[PDB]
Amino acid sequence: KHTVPYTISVDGITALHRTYFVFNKKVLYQEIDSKVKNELASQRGVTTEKINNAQTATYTLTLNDGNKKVVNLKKNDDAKNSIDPSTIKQIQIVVK
Amino acid sequence: IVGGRRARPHAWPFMVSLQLRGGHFCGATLIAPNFVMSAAHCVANVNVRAVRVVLGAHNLSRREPTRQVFAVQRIFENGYDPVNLLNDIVILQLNGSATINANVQVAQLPAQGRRLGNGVQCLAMGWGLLGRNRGIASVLQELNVTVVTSLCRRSNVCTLVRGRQAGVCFGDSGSPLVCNGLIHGIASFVRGGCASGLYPDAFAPVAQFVNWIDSIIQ
Ligand SMILES: *[C@@H]1O[C@H](CO[C@H]2O[C@@H](C)[C@@H](O)[C@@H](O)[C@@H]2O)[C@@H](O[C@@H]2O[C@H](CO)[C@@H](O[C@@H]3O[C@H](CO)[C@@H](O)[C@H](O)[C@@H]3O)[C@H](O)[C@H]2NC(C)=O)[C@H](O)[C@H]1NC(C)=O
Numbered sequence: 168k169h170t171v172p173y174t175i176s177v178d179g180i181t182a183l184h185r186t187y188f189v190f191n192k193k194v195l196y197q198e199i200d201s202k203v204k205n206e207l208a209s210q211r212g213v214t215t216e217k218i219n220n221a222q223t224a225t226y227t228l229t230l231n232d233g234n235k236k237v238v239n240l241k242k243n244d245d246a247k248n249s250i251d252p253s254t255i256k257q258i259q260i261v262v263k
Numbered sequence: 264i265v266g267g268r269r270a271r272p273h274a275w276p277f278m279v280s281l282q283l284r285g286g287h288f289c290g291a292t293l294i295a296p297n298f299v300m301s302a303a304h305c306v307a308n309v310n311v312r313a314v315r316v317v318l319g320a321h322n323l324s325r326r327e328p329t330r331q332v333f334a335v336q337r338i339f340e341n342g343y344d345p346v347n348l349l350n351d352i353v354i355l356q357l358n359g360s361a362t363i364n365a366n367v368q369v370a371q372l373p374a375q376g377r378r379l380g381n382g383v384q385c386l387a388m389g390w391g392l393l394g395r396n397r398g399i400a401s402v403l404q405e406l407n408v409t410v411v412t413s414l415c416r417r418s419n420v421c422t423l424v425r426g427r428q429a430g431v432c433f434g435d436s437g438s439p440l441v442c443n444g445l446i447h448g449i450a451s452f453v454r455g456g457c458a459s460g461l462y463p464d465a466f467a468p469v470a471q472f473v474n475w476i477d478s479i480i481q
């Protein structure tokens with residue numbers, strides 16, 4: 168049961184509530200994408216069309232080792248890849 | 264709150280912590296014994312039955328007998344738009360009435376339509392992050408800020424700390440902005456990250472909603 172804080176910025180605007188993803192036991196990036204896209208829609212009314220028409224739409228994993236992985240919400244070549252969720256420190260979701 | 268100071272214990276007895284799974288996620292303001300006021304985005308699509316409304320708190324890391332805890336009975340909203348965070352205000356009816364005492368008191372609100380000008384001195388507060396990429400505060404923080412209109416929508420109250428990087432941060436949403444003893448704002452969003460020193464912080468403008476608030480809380 169690992170908790171990971173995340174933030175959402177859309178058109179530069181970032182709501183200030185403290186939000187976590189709750190997941191050791193690896194998961195597919197697809198599982199993270201589903202939750203990220205659903206919360207983009209649930210929290211800021213971001214649609215598939217908004218994502219497709221933005222200049223950029225990504226989420227960045229900051230890992231506990233200090234490395235940062237950028238995942239494209241338009242194209243996720245790593246969708247079927249796996250990642251240890253316990254290695255993630257925070258996630259910055261950004262659409263603009 | 265980034266760049267602020269610890270508040271005196273129970274200095275602001277209307278200050279509320281909203282918690283999920285024993286963790287603070289948003290602030291709120293006690294506005295009647297059985298009603299709190301927060302940001303709509305705080306509760307827009309969450310497990311409402313699990314939300315704990317914590318009154319009379321100061322240090323979230325200690326056991327505190329001063330606390331009164333309630334559940335959310337009903338959600339009242341007024342034209343909330345999550346796309347642009349417009350009308351980012353909710354009134355939450357509690358499942359009971361608080362006992363008013365030294366540590367739990369209701370806030371005073373402005374008159375409908377009252378607008379604050381550039382330069383008015385206010386106080387922000389909350390249990391949000393103490394820095395960027397930080398963790399929740401233990402102790403309630405406060406911060407001297409100034410009302411500004413540059414880079415601010417007419418549908419918001421915006422504030423800035425001039426001359427240094429300080430401001431509200433994650434976990435501060437829903438918390439009151441106090442201006443001359445009255446609650447003029449509910450913390451809503453930032454631009455350019457927390458404490459940018461560039462964009463002002465944005466608050467839901469309480470004075471635009473007072474007639475509606477009054478119709479609910481009597
Ligand atoms: C308004 O709501 C609060 C919040 O409690 C919520 O918790 C869930 C699980 C639900 O059962 C319901 O109680 C509320 O939605 C109520 O405060 C709680 O009240 C109950 C019973 O009065 C307390 O249960 C007791 O807990 C101890 C162990 O901690 C047991 O040993 C006791 O036997 C007993 O079961 C509980 O402690 C309270 N929780 C908190 C955080 O204080 C409140 O009673 C309710 N008020 C009204 C007027 O309805």
Ligand SMILES: *[C@@H]1O[C@H](CO[C@H]2O[C@@H](C)[C@@H](O)[C@@H](O)[C@@H]2O)[C@@H](O[C@@H]2O[C@H](CO)[C@@H](O[C@@H]3O[C@H](CO)[C@@H](O)[C@H](O)[C@@H]3O)[C@H](O)[C@H]2NC(C)=O)[C@H](O)[C@H]1NC(C)=O
Pocket residue numbers: 384385386407441442443444445
């Ligand atoms: C940082 O903020 C605090 C408090 O701000 C809140 O309280 C009021 C005063 C106002 O700013 C409001 O928008 C917020 O609600 C400031 O603390 C206050 O400072 C004044 C003196 O500077 C205190 O004295 C009181 O005011 C009159 C003159 O204004 C004096 O003659 C009296 O002595 C009277 O006591 C006042 O008590 C303080 N208020 C509180 C709640 O402590 C603080 O000054 C400010 N810091 C800076 C640098 O501006």
